[PDB]
Ligand binder design. Structure first.
Ligand SMILES: CCOP(=O)(COc1ccc(C[C@H](NC(=O)O[C@H]2CO[C@H]3OCC[C@H]32)[C@H](O)CN(CC(C)C)S(=O)(=O)c2ccc3ncsc3c2)cc1)OCC
Lengths: 99, 99
């Protein structure tokens, strides 16, 4: 669909079998979700944002559905203020910006 | 234009008489720019993201040209790691997300 930006671009995602709300974020290289239990192995990682660096759990090759579009890729889990879908998954669902 | 997300969506902008590179960021409510000495009045503000908050100066009714499309609105100036064009200005150039 065509999503305008007068409101935050929030969508429903399905991950690890559960529904969550997340922000489509073209300024995020990577997808970062709030603390959650995810099955699978993970490794410690660091990511930086506007205010500094945080510690996250990096889960590779995770299935995630974004408005009924399937993606499989890296998901970082940590103390982000909001669930954000980054370019690593936006590219998989074919998202582009247009003006 | 159409902007794919394989790479960070960086574009040229014109602000306060100067040219800069900035990120088109649907996850940003507001527009945040690297330190610059813009004329006029401003108000202090704190904006938060991953890693915490930064202190910024809020300037009102600032004109920015984004790839030829003009916008007028609030601009926040502070020690951000990158120039970020947020939804408050993206809406004005009619930028949408499409997948
Ligand atoms: C030189 C680089 O240095 P650097 O690496 C960090 O650079 C950066 C810093 C910030 C951004 C933009 C943000 N991206 C992000 O955090 O993405 C992370 C996940 O994927 C990775 O890729 C890029 C970073 C990693 C988001 O799009 C927008 N944010 C909000 C969301 C909800 C969190 S916002 O900026 O916090 C923001 C903007 C306006 C606003 N108005 C009111 S609130 C408010 C909050 C891109 C790059 O670390 C230095 C220590």
């Amino acid at each position: 669909p065509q999503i305008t930006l007068w409101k935050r671009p929030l969508v429903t995602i399905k991950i690890g079998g559960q529904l969550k709300e997340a922000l489509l974020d073209t300024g995020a290289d990577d997808t970062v979700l709030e603390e959650m239990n995810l099955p699978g192995r993970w490794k410690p990682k660091m990511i930086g944002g506007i205010g500094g660096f945080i510690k996250v759990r990096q889960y590779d090759q995770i299935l995630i559905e974004i408005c009924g579009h399937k993606a499989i890729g890296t998901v970082l889990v940590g103390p982000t203020p909001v669930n954000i879908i980054g370019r690593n998954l936006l590219t998989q669902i074919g998202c582009t910006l247009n003006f």
